[PDB]
Amino acid sequence: FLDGIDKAQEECEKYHSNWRAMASDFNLPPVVAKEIVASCDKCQLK
């Protein structure tokens, strides 16, 4: 659980649905990357 996670939400649009690339940039396990998508309202619903 890194604060930089808040920063990832801002660029969530930049990574789009590719949470794997974001996880690689912040080096976080799928749990946090998926959680960030789960918070974004656009990447949540199709």
Angle at the Cα of 29 from the Cα atoms of 12 and 5, rounded to 5 degrees: 40
Residue positions counted in the chain? 46
Nearest to Cd ion of 3, 41 (CB atom):
41
Q: Provide the minimum distance between the beta carbon of 20 and Cd ion in the complex, in angstroms, as a whole number.
A: 14
Burial of 35 (0-12, 13-18, 19+ CB in 10 A): middle
Site string for Cd ion, 2-41 (x = CB under 5 A): ----------x---------------------------x-
Residue number, nearest CB to Cd ion: 40
